[PDB]
Ligand SMILES: Nc1ncnc2c1ncn2[C@@H]1O[C@H](COP(=O)(O)OP(=O)(O)NP(=O)(O)O)[C@@H](O)[C@H]1O
């Protein structure tokens with residue numbers, strides 16, 4: 523009875539398993555522990571994850587992402603109508619429900635959001651079975667704490683379509699606290715703040731744990747703020763640099779911009795552990811190579827307003843929970859963007875020097891807690 527914990531994120535998806543007293547965050551056959559939440563359709567095949575993401579510039583109208591923003595919602599929902607303006611793929615109305623419309627093997631096909639996510643879940647299932655050498659059926663799947671019943675049910679249906687037996691849908695911030703064993707600290711009630719900065723979204727949650735029971739006191743954040751905005755600032759920075767050096771604008775070459783974006787995302791990650799990072803792109807535009815660098819200070823300066831602004835949802839969450847910052851017992855970092863040293867410094871300063879829970883890889887913390895929960899329930 524091996525059950526997995528699955529964090530289905532807006533930008534990336536993670537799968538873990540708790541075995542013999544340790545959580546393994548499962549890497550795929552190329553050694554990558556993360557699967558982009560991307561699905562693509564071509565003349566001949568359906569691509570999932572990095573295979574789909576890697577060809578997005580060549581096949582933009584048939585490469586689907588952000589299905590988590592659509593799942594469980596209705597077509598006339600203002601959220602859906604606003605987000606549709608930013609996607610290169612078609613979203614159509616089927617009897618009040620949104621469907622993504624694509625060309626696939628020469629035919630027009632449409633998929634519900636939970637069908638798109640089930641394809642990502644199918645890959646997660648195969649990744650875990652590749653690692654475990656066994657059939658994997660039971661799963662705990664996480665969702666943001668603000669998801670309503672429709673979004674929870676549709677996320678569960680995505681698991682069911684993938685052949686998974688979803689033991690339970692649990693909140694992402696609750697999974698994070700479970701990962702740190704915060705419900706097992708026997709004592710008085712604990713106020714826990716989860717600071718979740720991902721690729722596309724920023725979620726602040728305050729939970730209270732009394733006698734080991736989780737209760738969501740408040741939620742705040744920004745559904746369109748994440749690591750991708752910081753990448754955007756880098757891309758604009760290097761587009762201006764390239765124009766300054768070569769008097770040429772690469773903006774309208776989708777492949778060039780995509781290759782610059784990929785380099786920028788990778789450089790950003792390096793700047794979390796190094797004070798400088800190199801950009802190396804052969805023949806970026808009209809045969810010209812782009813070899814340059816960026817310091818951590820410049821990356822921080824390019825994003826200073828976005829970084830500082832993450833504290834306003836923290837203040838709002840505390841206001842709604844009717845708690846002073848000093849009443850928070852544990853601060854938990856979640857999401858890949860919280861590895862940014864400036865974000866950690868801003869949040870720890872905000873809490874008057876209080877140490878942050880961050881020893882679990884923040885982009886893995888939700889899948890870690892989901893995997894523990896899956897073992898408890900199976
Ligand atoms: N070491 C790092 N330093 C800085 N950013 C990082 C690092 N590792 C990952 N990221 C960024 O973290 C983001 C992805 O975080 P992750 O938590 O894995 O996505 P997610 O779970 O899909 N969250 P979300 O998109 O908000 O639903 C991307 O923008 C990455 O570039």
Ligand SMILES: [Mg+2]
Nearest residue numbers: 529531720888
């Ligand atoms: Mg996540």
